[PDB]
Design a protein around this ligand. Sequence first.
Ligand SMILES: O=C(Nc1cc(COCc2cn(CCNC3=c4ccccc4=NC4CCCCC34)nn2)ccn1)Nc1cccc2c1[C@H]1CCCCN1C2=O
Ligand SMILES: O=C(Nc1cc(COCc2cn(CCNC3=c4ccccc4=NC4CCCCC34)nn2)ccn1)Nc1cccc2c1[C@H]1CCCCN1C2=O
Ligand SMILES: *[C@@H]1O[C@H](CO)[C@@H](O)[C@H](O)[C@H]1NC(C)=O
Ligand SMILES: *[C@@H]1O[C@H](CO)[C@@H](O)[C@H](O)[C@H]1NC(C)=O
Ligand SMILES: *[C@@H]1O[C@H](CO)[C@@H](O)[C@H](O)[C@H]1NC(C)=O
Ligand SMILES: *[C@@H]1O[C@H](CO)[C@@H](O)[C@H](O)[C@H]1NC(C)=O
Ligand SMILES: [Cl-]
Ligand SMILES: [Cl-]
Ligand SMILES: [Cl-]
Ligand SMILES: [Cl-]
Ligand SMILES: [Cl-]
Lengths: 532, 532
Amino acid sequence: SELLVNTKSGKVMGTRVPVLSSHISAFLGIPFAEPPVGNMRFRRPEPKKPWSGVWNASTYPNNCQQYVDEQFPGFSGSEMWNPNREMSEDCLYLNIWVPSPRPKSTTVMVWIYGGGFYSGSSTLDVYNGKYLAYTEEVVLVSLSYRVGAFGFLALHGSQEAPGNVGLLDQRMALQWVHDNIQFFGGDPKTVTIFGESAGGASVGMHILSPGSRDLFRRAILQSGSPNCPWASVSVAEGRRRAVELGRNLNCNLNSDEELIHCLREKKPQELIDVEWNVLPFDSIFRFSFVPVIDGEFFPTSLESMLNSGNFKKTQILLGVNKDEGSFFLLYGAPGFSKDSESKISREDFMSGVKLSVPHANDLGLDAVTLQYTDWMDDNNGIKNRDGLDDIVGDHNVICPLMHFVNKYTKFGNGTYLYFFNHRASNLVWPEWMGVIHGYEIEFVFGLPLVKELNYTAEEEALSRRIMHYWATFAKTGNPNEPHSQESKWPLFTTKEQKFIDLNTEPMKVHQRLRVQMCVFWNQFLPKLLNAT
Amino acid sequence: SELLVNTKSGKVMGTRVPVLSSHISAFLGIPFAEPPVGNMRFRRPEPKKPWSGVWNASTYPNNCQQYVDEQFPGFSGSEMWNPNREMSEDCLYLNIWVPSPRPKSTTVMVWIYGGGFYSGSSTLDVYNGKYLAYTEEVVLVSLSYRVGAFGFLALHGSQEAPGNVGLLDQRMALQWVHDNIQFFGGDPKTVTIFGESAGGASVGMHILSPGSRDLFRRAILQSGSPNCPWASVSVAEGRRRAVELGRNLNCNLNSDEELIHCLREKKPQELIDVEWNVLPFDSIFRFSFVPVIDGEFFPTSLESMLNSGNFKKTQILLGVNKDEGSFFLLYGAPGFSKDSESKISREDFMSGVKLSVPHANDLGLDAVTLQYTDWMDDNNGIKNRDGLDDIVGDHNVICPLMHFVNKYTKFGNGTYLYFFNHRASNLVWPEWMGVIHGYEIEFVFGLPLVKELNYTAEEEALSRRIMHYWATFAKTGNPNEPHSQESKWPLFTTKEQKFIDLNTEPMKVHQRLRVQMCVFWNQFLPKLLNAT
Ligand SMILES: O=C(Nc1cc(COCc2cn(CCNC3=c4ccccc4=NC4CCCCC34)nn2)ccn1)Nc1cccc2c1[C@H]1CCCCN1C2=O
Ligand SMILES: O=C(Nc1cc(COCc2cn(CCNC3=c4ccccc4=NC4CCCCC34)nn2)ccn1)Nc1cccc2c1[C@H]1CCCCN1C2=O
Ligand SMILES: *[C@@H]1O[C@H](CO)[C@@H](O)[C@H](O)[C@H]1NC(C)=O
Ligand SMILES: *[C@@H]1O[C@H](CO)[C@@H](O)[C@H](O)[C@H]1NC(C)=O
Ligand SMILES: *[C@@H]1O[C@H](CO)[C@@H](O)[C@H](O)[C@H]1NC(C)=O
Ligand SMILES: *[C@@H]1O[C@H](CO)[C@@H](O)[C@H](O)[C@H]1NC(C)=O
Ligand SMILES: [Cl-]
Ligand SMILES: [Cl-]
Ligand SMILES: [Cl-]
Ligand SMILES: [Cl-]
Ligand SMILES: [Cl-]
């Protein structure tokens, strides 16, 4: 009865799941779009046709087709991010966790997974929504969206492969939540969208895009922002990559209709096998098929939108991890496995700089090199490793986010900024990698509350603190409970630019998160590359 | 009799002067050139015609015509650098201090004064050679040379005003020493030239110039080097400045002969009154009439000469002071007078950067600003002052010298590098100015040995140490006394790049003198300006 819900698309039947010696309701694999298959591959999503009968929503759905990571077969640290369900183009489903008994109209949080817009699943163990839903009494939704060429092949002008359809998949799940979440006890007027990495970029993209703004109340962005250098391409570059993808499969390249028709007849794994070939350079933290600045989903360039205040004005909470770049270098820079601690020579540093800033001319490479080299000690393998670590994280995550946060805060209605710098006591990655891209997620989702996962008592308390900040922000637009005695997370303002650390120590307030390097990345280096 | 010397130019009569608790011989105002007056203005020097009778060399000669500093009238700190004798175009004389009794063939040191190539005198109290000559038993010579337009007006292709004649004055005094110093007890095979600021650039220029190399044995350069950005100009820029000097004086500009003839009719002070007007930019640490890269004194560009080893190969000793920039900012950046300790707003920082790197485009100015700004704390008046202080000293003095050191050491026969960072206990300048441009000279010349000047006894010991380093280097090409128990001043090498501090504390060896900023000034910013 609790598990039986009549929606505007049909009746659904959920399942009762255990969580921390109690139970809650889960509705898994609810369809929100027509399967984007056959002649609908690369097309805008269509609403799911209402069904008769009872949709069985007790099991996780398929994951979208995607490149599977085989760098470290069997290693939990990488396997925890891979699809744990069968892959299929039939993947546009959402999941809902509902406190029990069902609330009347409580706060809703909607998760958007990351994965560079080429990978990701709503069904990962680390996205299990039951702990956050139970502990904070929120309705927790996780959506899905098409990735890779299936989500972001962009032949602008064509209505058959317009680009950005994976962003429209997300918007369609948000529309479904808007129309139906009230029947699961959720308040459609108090929906917070949150996501990490490409999920965080996505969240920012919905803040910008006029067509998405009314489908949510406020936003949380983790280690990602819409202006990230890897998160979008021009319509020309998207067109170039789509054609290059056809060339890699010996397709007729004479017309969009011919190219698209050829691509629609390849098996999914055939597109995935060639996906990495269309990139313009050898590079790390670059992805083949990503959103396009199309003049439709994004009316103008992201910078002009940010400059003019052309975005949803609300409250945002956002932040970064200390070592965003480490796993990208381990995976993509060969020098990082010549040494057990990944100390690297000066030659490998220079090579890595080229791989990490692939768009820079030779003068920009020197500028990057000079900014991150200790010329008193340039053969120090540790300083070389750490310098290139910072380059990757600053360029791709931290400084784009700081640019976004300063532009947004001029027009928005409240900004809260964090710096997550706790290394989990049970981490399986080597210590030099630090606080890795993605490893705040398990704290946000409450995993340290599970005794058998072997976190410390301090880490359970940190997880509880973070979940409550997140939910209280979702509920009120402010992560703090005023009237409490706890330390207060202060607003980020244009003038004082305050942020807090998130770790196991008592709260610290700082100002101007990595301002020195982000002036280099956000102001000086683009001016240098614009000059030459 | 000891005071009577027969030279190849005629007999000279010197004077016995007291030094400390003893006495020494001095031969003051010996002419080495025909007075460059009348039609000889701007012309290459001519050897002094031998005289009959006895030249009375018992008093200091006139100083050359020059801009007199009146910024702080009566203030000892600035007046100690102004002419203390009458100014005259009849100024090509030299001074010699000779130990008593006369040595048979002792080490010779020849002093070349600085002053931006637009000022300077051989007769300043701080250049009194008697202490060094007495204490170290060397024959000490100080020369003079024409400064300003008189010495460096350059209309290339003209034989009436060819440029570089002030350097040819220096060379002709060196030739006089070569021909005659044996008659004063000096060894002409063991002559060291040394000078500070423009005198140090000059010393460097005789190392480069083939017509000078055989007139000295080894070289000492203090706070100056031949490649400094203020120390030379192209022939085109020298010609532009000379023409602009005529324009300022309503001269006929139709030809070199007419321009020169007009210029030769003006009183010296009329040239000096308009000297600063020919500079191409508003600037500090830039001077109007300086050596020209002419293809004769300098056969090719300084950089190509340095790169190919086209220079005298011998031993050099050289170094810099801690705060080369400070008095240039006091004099020329009005922000340094708004506040007692010269705290500097951000606006005045940015203006000073423009004044200090006047040749840079906007991208280069931003590069400089970024490199010297603490963006966590950009309104700190102390940090802004110190940052602009370091900009001026690094750009104009320290990093040019480091570039010269590294090029020279690839081909030379022994390099010794120092960093002078003692602030005299009796300094009359405010504390923020630190170790000022020129204030190591008084230690080199042994003024702390004079009790009436209220130096500390530890500063006397430091002066004695430096005089002994300098003279021992002049005598042997190594500042260290062999078979000694003191710590050794190490050779500077391409690989280890060692230098010492000069101060009252025990000797410390360091490596890579200001390498971080000098990579910026010597490698990156030039590449940036060349490319953009
Ligand atoms: O040319 C290319 N480029 C290319 C670039 C990548 C991007 O590598 C970084 C990356 C990886 N992932 C998914 C992992 N998931 C996550 C984590 C995983 C570990 C730790 C933290 C994590 N945090 C996460 C947070 C967010 C979620 C996702 C997270 N995302 N980004 C991948 C593949 N190919 N590949 C190519 C082409 C031809 C041959 C080869 C290769 C490459 C294939 C791989 C190297 C060896 N290769 C070949 O032999
Ligand atoms: O007008 C100029 N420059 C300019 C520079 C001066 C002289 O200032 C530096 C100087 C002075 N001295 C003789 C002192 N003797 C010494 C010391 C004296 C004190 C402490 C240590 C000492 N150590 C010594 C070691 C060596 C020997 C000599 C030493 N030498 N250098 C005069 C006039 N004009 N640039 C320019 C051009 C166009 C527009 C603008 C500007 C600027 C400047 C005007 C405001 C903003 N500006 C513009 O709008
Ligand atoms: C729904 O699916 C689950 C898992 O396959 C199954 O246990 C349950 O009985 C199903 N309910 C139906 C088919 O009514
Ligand atoms: C948010 O908006 C309300 C309504 O205009 C305003 O009163 C409040 O000051 C704003 N707060 C912030 C932090 O911008
Ligand atoms: C040398 O010149 C000085 C200064 O005019 C003078 O006092 C001295 O008597 C002269 N000595 C001679 C002419 O022998
Ligand atoms: C100086 O030259 C001599 C002669 O070739 C050589 O033996 C000596 O090693 C050189 N010293 C330096 C420091 O270059
Ligand atoms: Cl198919
Ligand atoms: Cl680290
Ligand atoms: Cl626990
Ligand atoms: Cl705490
Ligand atoms: Cl005259």
